[PDB]
Amino acid sequence: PFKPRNYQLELALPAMKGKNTIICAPTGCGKTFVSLLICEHHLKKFPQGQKGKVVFFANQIPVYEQQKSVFSKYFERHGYRVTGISGATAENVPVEQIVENNDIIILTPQILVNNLKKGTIPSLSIFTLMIFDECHNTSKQHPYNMIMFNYLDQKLGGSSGPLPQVIGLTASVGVGDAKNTDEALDYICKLCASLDASVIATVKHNLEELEQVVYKPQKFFRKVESRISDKFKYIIAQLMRDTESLAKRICKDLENLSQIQNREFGTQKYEQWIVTVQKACMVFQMPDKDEESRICKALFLYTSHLRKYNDALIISEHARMKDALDYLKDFFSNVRAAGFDEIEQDLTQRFEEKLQELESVSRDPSNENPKLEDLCFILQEEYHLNPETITILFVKTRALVDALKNWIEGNPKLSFLKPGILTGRGKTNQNTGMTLPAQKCILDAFKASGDHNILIATSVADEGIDIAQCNLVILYEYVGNVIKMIQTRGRGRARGSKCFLLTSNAGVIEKEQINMYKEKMMNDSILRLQTWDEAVFREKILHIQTHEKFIRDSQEKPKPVPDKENKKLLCRKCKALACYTADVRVIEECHYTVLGDAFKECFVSRKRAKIFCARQNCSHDWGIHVKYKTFEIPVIKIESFVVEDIATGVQTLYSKWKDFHFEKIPFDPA
RNA sequence: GAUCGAUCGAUCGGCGCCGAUCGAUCGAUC
Numbered sequence: 001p002f003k004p005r006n007y008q009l010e011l012a013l014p015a016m017k018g019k020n021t022i023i024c025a026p027t028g029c030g031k032t033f034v035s036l037l038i039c040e041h042h043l044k045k046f047p048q049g050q051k052g053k054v055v056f057f058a059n060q061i062p063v064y065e066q067q068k069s070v071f072s073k074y075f076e077r078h079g080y081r082v083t084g085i086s087g088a089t090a091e092n093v094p095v096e097q098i099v100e101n102n103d104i105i106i107l108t109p110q111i112l113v114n115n116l117k118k119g120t121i122p123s124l125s126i127f128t129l130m131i132f133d134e135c136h137n138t139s140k141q142h143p144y145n146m147i148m149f150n151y152l153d154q155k156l157g158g159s160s161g162p163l164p165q166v167i168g169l170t171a172s173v174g175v176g177d178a179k180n181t182d183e184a185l186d187y188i189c190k191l192c193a194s195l196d197a198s199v200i201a202t203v204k205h206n207l208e209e210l211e212q213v214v215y216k217p218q219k220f221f222r223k224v225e226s227r228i229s230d231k232f233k234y235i236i237a238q239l240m241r242d243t244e245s246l247a248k249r250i251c252k253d254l255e256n257l258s259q260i261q262n263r264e265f266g267t268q269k270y271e272q273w274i275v276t277v278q279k280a281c282m283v284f285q286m287p288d289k290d291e292e293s294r295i296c297k298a299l300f301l302y303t304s305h306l307r308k309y310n311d312a313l314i315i316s317e318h319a320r321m322k323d324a325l326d327y328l329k330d331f332f333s334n335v336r337a338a339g340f341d342e343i344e345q346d347l348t349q350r351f352e353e354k355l356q357e358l359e360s361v362s363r364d365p366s367n368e369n370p371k372l373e374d375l376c377f378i379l380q381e382e383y384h385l386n387p388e389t390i391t392i393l394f395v396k397t398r399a400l401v402d403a404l405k406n407w408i409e410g411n412p413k414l415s416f417l418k419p420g421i422l423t424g425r426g427k428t429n430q431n432t433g434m435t436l437p438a439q440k441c442i443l444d445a446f447k448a449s450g451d452h453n454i455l456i457a458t459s460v461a462d463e464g465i466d467i468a469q470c471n472l473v474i475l476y477e478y479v480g481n482v483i484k485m486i487q488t489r490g491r492g493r494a495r496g497s498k499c500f501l502l503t504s505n506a507g508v509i510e511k512e513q514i515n516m517y518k519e520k521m522m523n524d525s526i527l528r529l530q531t532w533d534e535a536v537f538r539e540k541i542l543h544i545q546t547h548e549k550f551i552r553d554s555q556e557k558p559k560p561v562p563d564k565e566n567k568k569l570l571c572r573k574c575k576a577l578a579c580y581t582a583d584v585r586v587i588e589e590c591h592y593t594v595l596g597d598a599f600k601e602c603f604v605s606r607k608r609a610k611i612f613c614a615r616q617n618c619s620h621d622w623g624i625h626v627k628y629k630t631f632e633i634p635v636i637k638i639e640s641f642v643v644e645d646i647a648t649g650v651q652t653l654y655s656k657w658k659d660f661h662f663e664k665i666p667f668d669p670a
Numbered sequence: 671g672a673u674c675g676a677u678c679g680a681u682c683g684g685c686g687c688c689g690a691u692c693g694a695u696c697g698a699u700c
């Protein structure tokens with residue numbers, strides 16, 4: 001099979017002695033083989049009559065599947081029962097029939113957290129070796145931190161029998177959130193205490209052998225100047241000024257709904273301001289139902305158009321003007337066919353008046369994004385120096401991912417590129433997201449073989465996913481903490497690989513330099529901590545654990561009070577009476593629906609039949625029809641309703657059903 | 671294999687929230 005290297009045996013030396021250690025090593029050095037060697041040494045040290053029990057806490061379903069596969073390929077020869085439980089498994093063979101019947105369990109932290117919460121698993125004393133893959137995720141309320149909280153509550157105070165040995169497989173301790181070396185050392189000590197670890201053993205003796213396996217790529221900053229002749233920006237700013245003037249003429253109180261003083265077009269500040277104004281416009285009270293409905297609908301349309309224009313301006317500064325124009329046209333086409341209105345027709349005519357000028361300006365070779373020009377130049381230079389490279393170009397947004405894909409596919413200069421999309425699961429407001437097998441089949445085709453030359457990922461290909469050794473780590477304005485910097489930089493580990501960082505905003509290069517200084521400070525702090533004695537560090541982590549336990553078990557009572565009186569749910573756009581609180585039924589605490597014949601004639605059905613408001617021109621989505629065991633009763637979304645009291649006139653808003661505190665009557669077919 | 675609803679957690683940016691990114695769990699569907 002595989003032969004253990006020198007550094008792979010050095011990293012597993014303190015773990016094989018019986019002490020809780022943290023294995024810090026660069027990404028791609030083979031920490032999985034170190035964990036396998038530790039598991040083999042742990043399961044072979046028990047005398048006759050007893051038997052160990054190892055649990056490997058993964059973080060992702062692909063990572064969990066890969067770990068289960070490698071553990072089965074490595075351990076089924078010795079005669080150990082390797083198993084794995086996750087979200088994909090069916091409601092059968094309870095965990096007590098799997099944990100008490102196997103030796104190596106590849107688990108997910110939320111499954112064990114739920115099992116310890118509902119009281120299925122008695123305590124963590126059943127296991128003998130817990131291995132947390134990428135233990136840097138131990139944070140304020142991470143499921144790793146919940147398992148560690150349970151372990152510490154079992155250790156401190158109510159001392160139970162033998163406790164399992166905790167071992168981390170992180171790649172970076174992530175001193176992020178700290179300022180100087182003292183705060184970095186404090187954070188490292190806090191993390192080692194939360195994980196109950198006494199050793200941060202790293203490769204120090206045979207460091208020359210590690211460089212022949214993993215190669216730290218050289219960083220390359222690229223500050224590009226913003227465009228000067230931006231006619232698209234000017235036209236969209238004029239349209240936004242016209243829309244804001246109309247909204248102010250119809251409202252007369254827009255300057256007092258938000259506290260934002262200086263709001264410039266095409267920034268996140270204007271987005272926050274317009275979101276606050278939209279959320280404050282839905283809360284209106286006046287003795288005129290039709291007038292209030294008309295005013296609120298007009299204000300909702302105005303703020304929706306302003307937010308869409310601001311999103312188009314934000315997309316225009318990161319991609320081509322054609323992408324922002326296509327986004328605006330798609331939004332206008334989707335909102336025009338929904339509902340025709342006077343304000344809607346006015347805004348559509350005002351937009352189509354400048355549509356020809358926008359089409360003429362966007363289709364200009366001189367009006368090209370300088371960031372995209374520099375990216376194309378870098379790609380040309382890299383693929384001309386070596387035509388066998390693979391790019392792992394990182395992007396912040398999904399819309400920007402699609403824009404970069406359409407730009408690469410539609411560029412005569414970039415004829416040698418075969419782009420690939422890699423997004424995350426779960427639907428969004430615009431995108432639908434990629435599933436697990438789609439991600440797997442796309443990542444399996446991105447390598448030196450072919451069918452793919454550049455993977456346009458977005459914050460998903462830098463956590464736990466195994467990818468081929470890349471030669472280009474261009475970061476299209478994608479920065480974060482020191483952990484994210486080390487994770488993305490660790491993707492390209494081939495011989496003679498670079499890591500480009502393109503940006504057009506003064507401050508991103510400063511943040512990347514701060515992250516590099518924080519990484520150097522983290523390395524210095526680890527080197528300083530690796531010189532302390534075992535007793536002093538054990539006493540320090542014990543004091544930190546005692547303080548954390550005293551702080552944690554003192555404020556864990558966020559108990560609310562349920563509401564009793566009836567409340568009505570008016571629409572969010574037109575503010576029409578939809579239903580009351582007494583008619584809202586709850587199926588299984590996650591299927592909030594409405595029961596009543598009055599509500600059936602208050603929506604229109606247009607995946608499954610998504611419902612919309614039954615008014616003249618509203619087209620506001622309330623919810624969707626779900627096919628239950630027998631019925632097809634529709635569920636609603638609280639993100640499209642406003643709650644109004646019957647006695648009082650308050651109109652507070654709620655983002656999720658958990659914030660809405662009321663008498664949740666359980667659903668009943670009878 | 672493809673959805674839907676709910677919930678949790680982490681990260682980034684901006685003024686406790688908002689927007690974005692990702693991960694997971696629980697339930698039902700085809």
Ligand SMILES: Nc1ncnc2c1ncn2[C@@H]1O[C@H](COP(=O)(O)OP(=O)(O)O)[C@@H](O)[C@H]1O
Pocket residue numbers: 002003004005008026027028029030031032033466
């Ligand atoms: N002793 C070894 N001999 C051969 N290949 C090894 C050895 N140790 C590790 N590797 C390779 O290194 C890779 C490391 O992958 P993985 O552990 O998932 O990522 P990371 O090392 O970043 O945690 C494995 O795919 C394995 O093939």
Ligand SMILES: [Mg+2]
Pocket residue numbers: 031032133464
């Ligand atoms: Mg790993």
Ligand SMILES: [Zn+2]
Pocket residue numbers: 571572573574575576613614615618619620
């Ligand atoms: Zn409506």
